[PDB]
Design a protein around this ligand. Sequence first.
Ligand SMILES: [Ca+2]
Ligand SMILES: [Ca+2]
Ligand SMILES: [Ca+2]
Ligand SMILES: [Ca+2]
Ligand SMILES: [Ca+2]
Ligand SMILES: [Ca+2]
Ligand SMILES: [Ca+2]
Length: 903
Amino acid sequence: MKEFYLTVEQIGDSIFERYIDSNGRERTREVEYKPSLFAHCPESQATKYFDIYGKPCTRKLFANMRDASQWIKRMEDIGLEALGMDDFKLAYLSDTYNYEIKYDHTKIRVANFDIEVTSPDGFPEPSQAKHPIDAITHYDSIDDRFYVFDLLNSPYGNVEEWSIEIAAKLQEQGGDEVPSEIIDKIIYMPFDNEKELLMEYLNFWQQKTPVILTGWNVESFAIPYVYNRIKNIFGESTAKRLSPHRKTRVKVIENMYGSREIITLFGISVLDYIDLYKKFSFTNQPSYSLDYISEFELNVGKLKYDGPISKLRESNHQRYISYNIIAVYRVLQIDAKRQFINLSLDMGYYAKIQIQSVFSPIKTWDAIIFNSLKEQNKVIPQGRSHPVQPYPGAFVKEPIPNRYKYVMSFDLTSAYPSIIRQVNISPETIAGTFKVAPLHDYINAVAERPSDVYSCSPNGMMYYKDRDGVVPTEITKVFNQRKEHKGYMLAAQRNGEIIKEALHNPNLSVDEPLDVDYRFDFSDEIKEKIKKLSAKSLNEMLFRAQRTEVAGMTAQINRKALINGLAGALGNVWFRYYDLRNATAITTFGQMALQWIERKVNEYLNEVCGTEGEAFVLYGDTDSIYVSADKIIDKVGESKFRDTNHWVDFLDKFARERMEPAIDRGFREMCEYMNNKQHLMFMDREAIAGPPLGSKGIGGFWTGKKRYALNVWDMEGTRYAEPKLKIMGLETQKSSTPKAVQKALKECIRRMLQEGEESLQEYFKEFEKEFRQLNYISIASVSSANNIAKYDVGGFPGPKCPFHIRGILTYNRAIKGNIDAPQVVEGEKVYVLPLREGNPFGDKCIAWPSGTEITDLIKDDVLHWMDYTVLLEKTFIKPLEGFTSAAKLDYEKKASLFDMFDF
DNA sequence: ATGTAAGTAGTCCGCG
DNA sequence: GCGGACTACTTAT
Ligand SMILES: [Ca+2]
Ligand SMILES: [Ca+2]
Ligand SMILES: [Ca+2]
Ligand SMILES: [Ca+2]
Ligand SMILES: [Ca+2]
Ligand SMILES: [Ca+2]
Ligand SMILES: [Ca+2]
């Protein structure tokens, strides 16, 4: 096979590389890498190296990497540019792998692990590691085995061996329900003392040295704890055995009360799954406990046990170990669904970076662009210092707050990357400037044509048309991958709806799910067979289609994020190609595009409807327009439609056959006006929205910018079996809103949009009557908690103390003394509840760590003193007041003259 | 070391 | 009690 790297490090004048060789075996090597950098030279000097602007450079080949670094310093002292890749391991990877890396993940050792540490005096801090590690479960992807290291003897108790037979049993029969599919994959190793457990773990680690190291919170807990515990017991040089090159760096952050640290293990790529999840999942969760995320992602139940975790090992060691094993497996299950490890490997090898650098779009793009430029013997510019400078972004239209019955939305495909490609925006394609007119003059096509020679943006910049920029070139490659995966996601989505439709009439038979590729629209013959399948087979097919959709989602949305990240990186001062002329060239062109096409759409619809001056576009944000379709429907008359799906078909066709071609003509004119390199403004229909035919539903409403709700029947060509709410910005979409309130507000919206005012009033009345009976956690608000110490004056609130921070201080006073009460961690999330006046906590609210039950000693008082009235008022009624006043209807029946009668 | 726009709701304080 | 300046948090793109 082709060789490919696993890990790379720079350690002094040596590059240390782990790799897979041509026989597919893992190897390691130390290389005295001889790097090159470059300096500008006179034109007379013949060379093969040119900077991106075409000025000649001379190559400086160095004896070692230190000499190269020292030269960069002297060039700074002299005042001349030092060109080339200054991150020498990227240069090394580029020289060593001068071809498209084709990697085989079955050769890459991916390790998932988790440890347990019993601690009777609070959270076991990794930096001190003063308590025994009494369990480790370590899954190895090459072996496909869970290696379990179990401490039987400890100062906090001596226990019997864990029983795999009890672990496999149902909970309801006193077992632990360790899933059957991993029982045969467990390798259990008990130990009589911690030293031999740890010694054996290190030897194991030597034999099976992780390349990718992951798990839940491993970076902030498991890794530093293991490292520091081994250091304390055996010494630092033993702890360094966790690095295959025996090198580590200890990063210590101090939070004033008290301290913690991150350990860099040289030669390992740590991808903490919590970090992968936060970057790649596009959720914002109220809690990031593994229980909460597992339930959210997998629909599995919370691993329950009686009593505190500090006493679980002693009271039920059997369950303690099973839960350690299950927790490692849960992460693997989440990754089987989300496929973030696969994404990370794809991206890292594509860019030729350390795999952990996928967290940095700047590093990723620096590497992609460097490699692209190197291939043409071009030399990259030196990174420079720039001061932070705010700059303008997107245009958002102010909507008239209102109900909006029939709506059709359209937006640009990959807007900012498409702008880059159309205009040809790159550091080396800049041709000059032109004198700018006010933006509205371009929007209304009264401004002078910027140029008949160069491709332009209304920020005043001009770019060469007949030569390709590295930014457009490389952004196009990732966009095309993005487009492929999005196609697969949408096919799977459409296939899902076909299955949902068929589930209305399942067949009474025993059959199997069809063997199909869900990434492609089902053939007619598959559709016929589906109509004869049982519920059993259909539900399994639906699950597979949904997993295929999620896999496509992960692949497309994160490639979308990467290319959008390039447009944004042009505005980050740490990006090598930082340039506000290019950053603003993008954002200003986007502003023009949206408002240009708003004008063109209004012009077109007035024309076809035979009217003049009517406002059809009701809203837009960045690259989208929302068109009121009421007049389109009224033109033919509602009476002509047989059912909801008939008018949906009508507008779908209208959008595709009439509006899109008008939109396209509008943008081709704009492209010619700016003399752009290539027309790439493709504004396709997103949503078709309205109430069910014959209902009193209002269809949709806006309260303001970035705040609206729509009843959607078709989304980007997916015709839904059941209408789906598209709600943006409203409290149902905010992780700070209590769970049960999100749910109740969503149902208020559903009723408003689908059923009408009276349905809403009916629901509101019921929820108000029953909400006092809801679980306290389900009605608690949520907030991130930053700068707790700043507002902490003797355990009491300092001036301008935020409400949630006040609650944390109340909690801290209440638990003072308790060494078992969970502490609120700085920057993490807390549940928050208001408290009635005269409560024993001595303040108007309390807050505790999110995703947890509040500690049992104060739980009773919280429940007794919860202010339900304030809670309902603030979290539910107030948002609902905003929705309903915007939509011009009432959530409570108004008093009237009719109240005088007995109905 | 991806970007900016923009929403709600908190504290503080003014207001015969 | 409500609105304006300021702070915190969160979301839409
Ligand atoms: Ca645990
Ligand atoms: Ca069960
Ligand atoms: Ca878009
Ligand atoms: Ca059937
Ligand atoms: Ca959009
Ligand atoms: Ca689209
Ligand atoms: Ca109590």
